[PDB]
Each structure stands twice: as structure tokens, then as C-alpha cells.
Design a protein around this ligand. Structure first.
Ligand code: CA
Ligand code: CA
Ligand code: CA
Lengths: 534, 534, 534
């Protein structure tokens, strides 16, 4: 039938699409969220399911203390010589005149297997991508960073041979391409198709000015000619399109000899009765992945349906394979494996932080550092993947100080979040309370009007109802009757477009956490986690 | 004989003084600078020498990724049962509603020995201090942090028994004191002298409003009565005093039965013809350590000469012992022990970052991340310890891209520094250039007028002349004749008082670094480092 | 009965005290509020009443378009040769490197009479003051402004002879005094007492650093020796004193041969459990006037009871004379003279803006510009003179567009106010709504929850209840039953200490206004204005 974009919803940027015989994979960036690199699978490009996170051990990925929207930027997944190859970037500095980062290569016979110890590559820029040429040679391309303050930082595309035999980059690196006048030249992928090397790049920056352009050359070294009809993909000029920020693309040639282009987009909340060119939108689901049909004209790729990118796209000629949901709407924590849709911040969880074993049918979180910490948070979360949903939990917790809190949280980064918590007060004992951070402005809007929790309540039920432009928390002591808490939040405030700083690259999550400042590691028992889209 | 304050000059805050027989030691905080905790020694309290940094391995101190002015906050050094005890704090969050941190205990027979594996304490607040009572019991006191947004964060002082036998805190923790109306109640120390437990606290915050106050109780638990003459120590009311920010003190009873008080101070640059109450001063030497003489009146300690603190103080009745200087004014790097006055950022130096062995008579730095990175900088530095000095070095470096640079740097934190570098330009090849960052605003003021370096120059000499309110760099190709580079910098911009953010707790350094963004680890060889105070 | 400071409450800064035989007057500055210069009168210094505003016509005072806290700065009232002399300053630029202003002289045989057409003086600084020497010569003193960006702006005090015969300043102006290291040298007054000319000056700026110092000379010309014990007056060093910002004084010698010192103060709102040195306070009543006793020691004046100034001060040896209240708690607008405690912004009211004749027993305000206009507002208001009070009104108004609004307002300046309004909405007709501006951040907190007004309600009753740290509006359709509108405001946000910008010199007002953007001048009739302190 039809592909319906986005195919990968909520936080799923920088799609790297990869064909392995008749299997299709997209790797997306995960930034500070662990484990690293989401890999989704499809047989038909219409239906997708989340199946792996290769970077799942400290030896592959060490992001303790990483800044928000540092860590895993755009990943590159390829398949060649009977194995998968993953190029990844760990970004350590996300703002200023430098973007210190490190690029690595790991491999694996399957995407869900145990990936090899990483090979050190370079760090001259992010967006490293591995090209396997048909003569058996291999090359890394990446953007080359120019820190000089009076220059634009995006110096062009650097190319260097990689040797699998020597496990290193070899020979000299060369700038092969400088990009167009749109600039922000990044995301390089090379494809050798017929008589040309095609160099695909993202341009314009990952905002509403995002695009993809194609250039081509008879030789890998260039010089590359820019498509006369550049860009290939962009909706910058069309503020009304459902898909915005169209860029950072990768190309696949299906086994059915068809051509598809994966790319990221943003889908703004309704902007309302406001100037359409000035207010391009807020995107709480972050950067999602969409896919377009490609046709060839005069040996240049072209986006079918127009460069703005379409929502409803002609599917390839492949019999459909639908997938079961990869989570239960109500997760009862009856398995010793945490659901693949849950991630934690920066580091691998250990039994000292989170346990499914300590108490059957519960997730026990042992309190760690606050919601503001870039080190160790006892906190697991999953993506908002719709503008309307309910998420909920119930938690058993016995705090005896305000330094202890456990609850349900909507979270973007360390200075942009809100939460409803079970905590403690000197005069009222156990209470429900609300805390939030709006671009590093902190508030507790209930003040003294916290809600006392009766001593005989074992599990406090906590719910968030996300309703497009706003959301609100509720609680229940019996799991049947719910009371609203009078604090209404704006969803746009958990968006790429609202958050401050050089790194604005993830999206809204909802999850559950336990804070214990005292160092006593107080446990909170969560009986379940629900997430139901409407 | 006179104690001439400050006794520990340049960045040396939060002094914890400790007597072991006739040896006196002061520990000061080091924040992100590694190895952690400076220990100075003295026989006479007049003459001090730097002798140790106990926190010198990752198992003791792991600050990779730590924020500026996180890491080691005020330390606590004591001597008892024939060994030294060091309480220390690794702060992970330096701003906002929380101050996530962790307290640890380590021990050693000597201050310059190999300190034992750390014992885990608590994290309810920083400023942890270990009190050894005369009945063989031991207690930890620290500040208790209240995150609640409508409350002052400084909830008071918490007390908990510590068991050496069990290697842990035991029993219940209790708040014992809430502080005065000055607030910012921190730096708790308990001394059991005669019939009272005395609780010393720092209050007012470590700015110009800093003070020390004393409270006393017949029991360790309280309740504590406050000195009717509080504070014990402060120069807030006297903006003309040479010593400012007088607070965070510790008390020593000398072996001669006299009483002295170590505390931190700031010494402002000249304020010039400006309102003396308004412009209290900028302190590029950070917070330094001074000592006051204490006398007793009605069982309360009192600072001799006035609570504002005196810059010169009558020394105890102990014959003078002077110490050899701990560095050479010209360090020729002919030894394979990096001088004790050099520190590096956050992590232990390895042979892959810095080497004295690779080339005899040289410090080789293998290029790592930029001056804005909280991860791995190939950068070693020493404190500004005077308002007027020269420092210089000479460097052999062959950069082939603007992503490589090595040079001489004045540095406060990742967003406050300036540097003169040997680097490369497309058109002129190897050149001398200036880069700076002023509260995260970057500049390269030479623009195109960078200084070409002749191909036959092996070592480029670089120098900074610091002259109280301004400093300026110059360079030499022969080691004798110098040319000034026309960028004049303001010393006040590398001061606690000027830098933005919640962590402003270090001081100006001067050092040498090598940046290589490419990942090639290009070596720079430094033939010497000179530091000479005028 | 004691003098109970402040003697002039609410916004009443820069007291210039003046004796005329056995009558005592104090002139205070009015900035943008018209008519200009308040004059209060007393027989006994204990009891004061408001009696005049000299600057009540455009030819004396034209402030159309003046910036906030521009206009009438400190005035100077004297009595010599059987008449009153008023020096006043019209400030046109309140921030940046200049303080463009103009000084004038007017005279009158009585404070409440018709003052003479102004004589043009100079513009070299504000705080001009007319000194009448005992030999018939007269002199103007003022501060002399230095705009140079690398200098403190306060160059010192300039002296120049003023000729009543020629109606101008004659001879050369000369700098006679440079001030102390406190700087912000301003507010010069000269008194020839015995063998000395005493020059009193304000220093430190009109914040918590405010003070007064005294210097003396045998000649009017200097050189002036500064009091060894300076300052004469300040509470800077005592953050707990009820009177703060003590400075900008004037000295009076009573007919009973006693000496008193009028000066401004701020009285902060309770600061709560917050650091007392850091949070010195917010003053919604602006700068008020107090009076101290002076005694003489070694021919230097000294404040009786300490430099900090006392709240309750011993009265002079003059029989008590108490005054009638100068307004009715409930003003029914039955007189055709608007009460003396009402002022308007910048310009004289005319019949086209406000009328008491149009409809007897009502104030009719004919709609003009918005609350953000520095030109023409149909808005009359009176000072907050206590931290606790109720003010109310009732209004008849038939808006037919959201461009029309009439109501009750708490107001500091064009970008700091709030109001409850009768206005109009497309779907609901006449409604009550809330508007506020917080340092130029505008909000309408009710959003869609406006309150419909029944068509049959003629007068809508509007009230504010000010209760120390907060205040809140209510309305009543029957004048008996009031309902609170759910929007709580912070009184601290209508204070000198909160408002942003270079001019922060007035204080909180409450009044009534009518806005009609359409240009149709729609009338709003107000039946009464109530102000009741408790
Ligand atoms: Ca369960
Ligand atoms: Ca050497
Ligand atoms: Ca009336």
C-alpha cells in the first residue's frame, strides 16, 4: 500500500538506512540516552519495529558527565563483507567555537548481537560515514570543523581511506567538497552508482532551514558537481507542509530495484492564529524519521511528489510484513528484562541503580542523584511518540526527608522537565508534590498546597495526560479514582525549538525516577508503567 | 615574628588546619584541578611549603566530565590515633536547585603517602568534617541541603556518628544547628574544648559577605547557643581592609598552647576611583589562605586585632624554620617528575597525554581536546600567585591544520581564558595567533594579522607579562628579543568575581597546552616553563 | 509625643526642609508625577500635612514624553527676603553616559500660592540648591556630571554665584569639593554656621549604600575638610535597622535653637528566612522622609543615637499642633476640586481628560492612551502609604471593544503595574479582566476565565487588598458582596528595588484610569475612591 510518514515516531533523528539482502535497517542517533543507537527493522519499508541498541557497554560508550545533546550524534550503519559496520560519534562539547568529538567503528554479524570492541578513527568533525567501494577499498567521510571565530564552522567534507586490515585510517585526508551557499554542510554519504560517485550532504542546519543536497563526480576525490536543481529535499520554502526540517538523509537501493530516501523531519504542534513564516513551530516529539520515494532524471536523484517531502508515499513492490507492538500498554514489570523502549541517561544501569530481581513484579529504583545531574540518575524513560497520550505508574516509597522523592516525569534535558513526586514534608509527612524546570528556571507551584498521603496507602498511582498543547498530572490512592493536580504544563516547552543551548537534539520523554540526595539509596517500587496513545 | 597573610597564595580556599605533634598542615580545596587536595606543611605557621596531593588516582577521585568548580570542595584533614584522616567531597552539580555531591573518607600514615581506598559516606550536603571526640567516638558533620525553591538552600548542620570499626556512618542523623540570620550556614567544625562543644560555621557565602560564627553547647547534640558578638570573623562591614571574604575557618590549638585560626580570603585588584561600597573588587588570585590569632574571652574565641582579620599577625612561640622553594623559576623539564605546582584538569596525566620521558629535557604534550572541553585536555598549569609576574615557555610544534595548536594560556575555566598559540593557516603556514573566551564570548582579535613563523624556527618562545590590572603576550624566535602581540587583556576577567555561573571557586592559572582536534595526537615539545614573581 | 519616622510616608524622597519663622516645610521630589514638588507643612516637626505642589502649570513644568523617574528630581526649598525660593530640576535622560537635565528657579510669597515664571539656571548636574549667605550674596550648588565612560560619573560639587538683580548665574562656576571614597557625591547643601561653611552631601547612591557626609571650610569656596568620622548618616553597615538607604539630607535650625536633619529612607518588606546581607529588601513605598536630631561635637554635626538613624526621635520644644486628615477615606467626588493626594502622569489634567463637572458626584475620565504611554493617560492615582490597606472604587463604563478599558490599578511605571478592568470581549460582552506588566513582561492571567458583567449593572465595584507581601483584586456588582479574582500579586514587584532601568525613584501608586485606543474618548464614570489603611 502506502508508507505513512513518519515511519519512526518521536525522538529518532539522523536516519542511516541500510539494506542487508532483503532486510532493511535504520540506525538513529540517541545522544545522551543509553544504550546507544536505535536500530529499527523492516521487510517492506512500510512497517517498522525497534530491535537493537548496539552501544550497550561502557567499553563501547562512556557518556558519564556528557552534556545534554552531546554523546551519540548521527550514526552510520552499513552492511558489507557479510557483516554490519557501525560508525558512531561521541560528542563531548556541544557549544562554542569547538565541537570536540570522537568517531569510532564497531562491527557485528547481526544488529542485535554483541558488537566488537571499537576501533578509534578520528575527530576532525562529526557525521562520520563509512563508504565501501566496489574495488574492495573503504573510506571514511565526515564534516571537517573550522573553529575560527570569524569563519562559518562547516569547512566542507573530508575524505580518508580506512583499512580494515590495519584497523586504522590510512594515507592522507583530503577536503573533497565545500558545499553550497546554504552552508552547514554535514551528513556526508557517498554512493557509487553507475558512472558516478554521488555525495549526499545535509545543509542549512537541522532547523526549519534544513535541506539535503546531492553532488556528483566521476571520481571519489571529486571535483563534485552540485545538482542544478539543489536542494534535493527541503521544506524551508513551504511553512505549511506537515513535514518540516527535511534533511540529513540516506539512500537505499532495494532488492526490487527501487530507490528510497530516509530523512529526519519535525512535526510542529498546531501553531494557531499566528504568523506562519515567523512561528514555524514547536516539536515535542523531536526529530523523527520519514522516508521518500526517489526517481532518477538525467542521472540525478529526485524526490517523488516534490522536494518538500510527502506524508503518503508509494511503498516498494514488496509483500507486507506487519510487526507486533514492542511493548505492552501496561508493563507490569513481570520480566527480568527491561523493555527495549526504555532508556536511561548516559550510563548502563546496574543492579545498584535499578532491579527487576529484588522484588518480583516490581521495578525497584534505588535513589540516586537529582533530575539536574549529568552523572547518575536512577531514572528510566521512553519517548513521547504521539501528541496525545496517557502514561502512568504506581509507586511504593517511604521517604523521611525532602531529600527523597520518587515519581513520574516528563523530561527533555537536565534543565527542562516537570514531575509529580511522592516525597516528604516536616509538617505533613508523606506528600505528593510538583517540581519543574523551564530552561533552568525552577518552580514548585503547589507551594504549601501539597497533597498529604495517608499512612496506609502502599502504592500511589501517578498519571500524566498529554493533550497536544498541554499536559497535566493526576494521582490516585486506589487506582480507580483519580484527582487532578492543579498545574498545567505547555508541551512546547519540552521541544527541540524551545530548549536553550547549543544542543537541542533529542525530544520529550516520560518515565519514572527515584532521587535520594542523602546517599542512603532509598528504594522506590514501581508496580507498573502504562503508555497508551489515543 | 609575623605571619604575613595570605600564607597560601593564589588559589587555595577552604583551609583545614591540622596539628600532628609539632607539624602543622593545611588542606585546601582543588575543585576540578588534579591531583586533588593541596596539602601544605609548616613548623612555625609563618613559612609554608606545598608537600602533597593525596587524591592522585582515579579510584580516589574521578572527575572526568565534572563541571567547572565542581569536584573537590572544602576538604577536612585531621590527625588522630596516629594517622591522618581526609574527608572530601566530589561535587557533580554546581548550580540550580540541587548540589548533588558525594562525601568520602580516606586515611594515611603520612600526608605524602599512599592514601587508603575511599570509604563511602553520605551526600546530604557538602563541607563534611570528621570530629574525633575524647571518648573514642567519631562524628561526621556537614551542611544539609534543602532543594525546595521557596526556601533558602542552607537548612543547617547535620551530625552523624561514624564507625571506624564498621567503616560507615551509624545510627541516626540529626540536624544540630540552624545557623544565624546571616544564613549560607556551612563549613561546620566541632571542637571539644574544656566544658563545651564549639561549633564553628562559615556564613554569608564565600563572597564579600563571608563570615565565620561560633556556637557552643555542653553536649555535642546541642542545643547550641550563638556567640552574642557574632560573627567571629568577617570583613563585610569594612570594604577597605586588605583581607576580604574572611570566612570558612578552622581552629588549631598549637603544641605551645596558643590558638590560631586558618581561613580563606580574597585580595581584590585595585578598584581605582570608583565607589568603595559598590565595587568591592575582582580577585584573579582566587581565594587564598590566611591565619588569625585567637584569644579567649568569657569562654568564647575572639580574633585578635578585630574580626575583619589582620594582614600581619603575631606568630606562635616556635622558632622559625624556612623551606627551600618548591619549583625552579626556570623549569627546564630535565626531571621526569612533573613539578608539584603543576596540575591538570580533572583526570590523571598519562604517557599518552604528557611525557617527560619521550624526549629528555622536554615536556611533550600529545594534542587532545580544546580549551572548552571538560574531558581530556593536554594541558598543564600553575596558579597565578602574585599580581605581577612573567611566565614563559618555548615550544616546538609542526601543525598542518588550524585544528592543531599549542601554546601558552591564562585560564580560569572552559569559558574564561586567553592564549597565544603556534598554529597553522592555509595561506601563511605556521603562524602565531591569539584566542580568548570572555564568559563564553569567543574572539580572535588578530584576525588576518597573525604572525608568520619562519620555517627554520625550531622552538618558538612565548611569554605573558602580568602587570596587576592587565596582561599581554609576546613571542621570540631567538629567545632574547621579544615582540609584543597587540592584544591587551584584563586580569579581572580571570577572577572569581567576574566569571558567570554557579561555580566561581578557583582562580587564575597559567600553563601550556596542545590541541589536536584531528585525532592525530600531534606532539608539541616544551623546552622549559618559567614563572617569576616581581 | 515622639517624632515617629518616617514623618512623610509613601513616595516622598529628597527632603529639603525649610523654616519660615515658626513654620516648617519639607519639599520632596515627584519625578514624572504632576503637579510637581510635594510640600508638607508642620509647626512641631512631629505632625505633618500635605499643603502644596508649586509646579502646576506647563510653563513651570512640561514633562510630556519624559522617561520614567525623569522629571522632578531632588528639589530645594528655601525662605529668604520674605519669600520662598524653589530650585528644581527637569531630568530628560535617566540612563547611559549622560543625565541631561535642566535647573530652574521659581519664587512665591507662600508655598501654596501662584509661583513665579521660572528663571533658567544651568544643566551641568542635578541636585541644585540655592544658598543665601548672610552678606546678601546667593549661590547655586549642584553636582557636576562627567560622562566619560572610564570615569565615575560624579565629578564633585560645583559652585556659582546667582544674581537676583540680573535673574541669572553670574561669574565663573568652580568645582569646590570632590567628595569621599564612597563616591556618588550629590545632594550638596551649604550652611554658614558660626565660623564655618558646612557642605552636606549625599554619597553612595540612593540604595542600601546611601549616606550623608559633611565637610567644612572657612570659605564658601573651600578648601573643604572632610569629617574624620564620616559618614554623618548611613545604615549601610546595619542590615537590620528599620530605616535603610539613609541619606540625601537637609539641615534645619529651629526657632527654639535646636537642630534637626531631614533625610530619605527606604523601609523594606519583611525579607523572611533569607540571608540578611544579601537580600537587603524591597521597598514598595519607595523612599520616604525621616528626621533625626543633630548635636554638635567639636564643631561637627552628629546624629543623636548613631549614624544609622532612629525610628522614634525626641520632638523639639514646640507645642503640638495636629492636623486634620487631608482626604476622606471614602472620596465621593462631590467637590469640584480633585483631592491634593491625587496626582496624574506628566501633564496637567484638563476637562478633556478628567472632569468633576460633567456629572456631579462622579469623576469622569475620558479614555486616552494605554498604561504603557509616556504621553497622555486618563489616570489619576495616590501613593501607597502603608504596607496594609484597601483601596476601591466603582465605575460605570460601556465598552464595545477590547480597545476600551476602565478600572483600578496598582502602578509603578509604564512597564510595572497591574489592573482589574471593566472591558469587552467578542463572545461575552462587558467583562472583568486582569492585566499586568512585570518589567516589560505582559500577561493576562485569566485568559478565557474573564468574569461577565450583567447588562443591568450600572456601577462595577472594584477593590484591591494590599497585605504586606501580596495583594489581590476583588469586584462587586452590588457594592456589598465582593469576590476575589484569583490572581495574587507580589508587592515587591512595585518597588524601587525591583523595577529595571536607570530610573527607580518613585514608588507604588494606586488609582483609576480609562483607556480608549479607538480615539472615541469613551467616558468612564467613577462614583468614589476609597483608601483605608489599617
Ligand atoms: Ca507489577
Ligand atoms: Ca629543557
Ligand atoms: Ca460619588
Amino acid at each position: 500500500s502506502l508508507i505513512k510518514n513518519p515511519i519512526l515516531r518521536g525522538f529518532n533523528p539522523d536516519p542511516s538506512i541500510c539494506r542487508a539482502d532483503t532486510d532493511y535497517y535504520i540506525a538513529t542517533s540517541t545522544f545522551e540516552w543509553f544504550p546507544g543507537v536505535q536500530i529499527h527493522h523492516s521487510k517492506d519499508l512500510v512497517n517498522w519495529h525497534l530491535v537493537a541498541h548496539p552501544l550497550n557497554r561502557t567499553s563501547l560508550l562512556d557518556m558519564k558527565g556528557n552534556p545534554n545533546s552531546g554523546g551519540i550524534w548521527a550514526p552510520d550503519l552499513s552492511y558489507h563483507d557479510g557483516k554490519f559496520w557501525l560508525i558512531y560519534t561521541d560528542v563531548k562539547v556541544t557549544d562554542g567555537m569547538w565541537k570536540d568529538c570522537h568517531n569510532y567503528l564497531t562491527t557485528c554479524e547481526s544488529v542485535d548481537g554483541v558488537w566488537s570492541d571499537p576501533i578509534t578513527l578520528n575527530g576532525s568533525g562529526f557525521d562520520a560515514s563509512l563508504f565501501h567501494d566496489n574495488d574492495g577499498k573503504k573510506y571514511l567521510v565526515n564534516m571537517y570543523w573550522d573553529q575560527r571565530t570569524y569563519n562559518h564552522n562547516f569547512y566542507g567534507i573530508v575524505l580518508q581511506e580506512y583499512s580494515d586490515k590495519e584497523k586504522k585510517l590510512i594515507g592522507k585526508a583530503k577536503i573533497i567538497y565545500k558545499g553550497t551557499d546554504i552552508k552547514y554542510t554535514e551528513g556526508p554519504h557517498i554512493y557509487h552508482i553507475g558512472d558516478y560517485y554521488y555525495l549526499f550532504t545535509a545543509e542549512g542546519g537541522t532547523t526549519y532551514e534544513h535541506s539535503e543536497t546531492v553532488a556528483r563526480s566521476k571520481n571519489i576525490d571529486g571535483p563534485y558537481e552540485i545538482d542544478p536543481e539543489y536542494p534535493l529535499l527541503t521544506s524551508w520554502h513551504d511553512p505549511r507542509n506537515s513535514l518540516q526540517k527535511c534533511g540529513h538523509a540516506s539512500l537505499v537501493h532495494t532488492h526490487t530495484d527501487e530507490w528510497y530516501l530516509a530523512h529526519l523531519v519535525g512535526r510542529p504542534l498546531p501553531v494557531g492564529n499566528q504568523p506562519v513564516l515567523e512561528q514555524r513551530g514547536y516539536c515535542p516529539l523531536g526529530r523523527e524519521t520519514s522516508i521518500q520515494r526517489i526517481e532518477w532524471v538525467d542521472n540525478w536523484p529526485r524526490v517523488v511528489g516534490g522536494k518538500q517531502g510527502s506524508v503518503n508515499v508509494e511503498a516498494p513492490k514488496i509483500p507486507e510484513v506487519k510487526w507486533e507492538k514492542t511493548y505492552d500498554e501496561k508493563d507490569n514489570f513481570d520480566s527480568d528484562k527491561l523493555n527495549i523502549n526504555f532508556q536511561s541517561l548516559r550510563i548502563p544501569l546496574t543492579e545498584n541503580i535499578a532491579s527487576l530481581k529484588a522484588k518480583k513484579g516490581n521495578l525497584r529504583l534505588y535513589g540516586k542523584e537529582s533530575l539536574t545531574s549529568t552523572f547518575t540518575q536512577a531514572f528510566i524513560a521512553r519517548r513521547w511518540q504521539s501528541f496525545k497520550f496517557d502514561a502512568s505508574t504506581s509507586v511504593s516509597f517511604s521517604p523521611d526527608t525532602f531529600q527523597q522523592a520518587a515519581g513520574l516525569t516528563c523530561y527533555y534535558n537536565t534543565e527542562n522537565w516537570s514531575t509529580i513526586q511522592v516525597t516528604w514534608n516536616e509538617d505533613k509527612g508523606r506528600v505528593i508534590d510538583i517540581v519543574c524546570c523551564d530552561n533552568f528556571h525552577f518552580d514548585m507551584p503547589l507551594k504549601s498546597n501539597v497533597i498529604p498521603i495517608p499512612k496506609d496507602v502502599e502504592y500511589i498511582h501517578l498519571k500524566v495526560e498529554v493533550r497536544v498543547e498541554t499536559y497535566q498530572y493526576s494521582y490516585s490512592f486506589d487506582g480507580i479514582n483519580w484527582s487532578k493536580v492543579p498545574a498545567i504544563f505547555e508541551s512546547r516547552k519540552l521541544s527541540d525549538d524551545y530548549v536553550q543551548g547549543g544542543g537541542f537534539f533529542t525530544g520529550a520523554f516520560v518515565g519514572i525516577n527515584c532521587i535520594d540526595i542523602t546517599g542512603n539509596n532509598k528504594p522506590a517500587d514501581f508496580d507498573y508503567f502504562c503508555y497508551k496513545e489515543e
